Amino acid sequence: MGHHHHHHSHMVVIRRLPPGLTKEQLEEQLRPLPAHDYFEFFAADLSLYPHLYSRAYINFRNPDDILLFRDRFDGYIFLDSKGLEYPAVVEFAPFQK
């Protein structure tokens, strides 16, 4: 009995998220990864936003999966119905054992 020893899963977070879209339309681009996991995603109404700021958190299974999506999603513009530019920046989360 033992384990196959899998590569270490490092945590990742997203930056520059203004209140507009809800997790349903928000996580679609935050967790479309192959081998990964996912955390709490915030909610918001574009029809007069709830004022406050909230941050989404991403979790992985493979460090290779990281550099894959981390490079392509590094500061990309997602557009809402109103034309709301979401400049989503993916980076490495402050690691805590």
Alpha carbons 23 and 71: distance in angstroms, whole number: 22
Technique behind this structure? NMR
Domain housing 94: 1-97
Q: How many domains does the chain have?
A: 1
Alpha carbons 70 and 73: distance in angstroms, whole number: 6
> Contact 63/7 with Cβ under 8 angstroms?
yes
CB atoms within 10 A of CB 59: 15
Helix (H), strand (E) at residue 70:
helix 63-72
What would the two tokens of residue 41 be? 């995603």
Question: Where residue 35 sits, what CATH number does that domain have?
Answer: 3.30.70.330
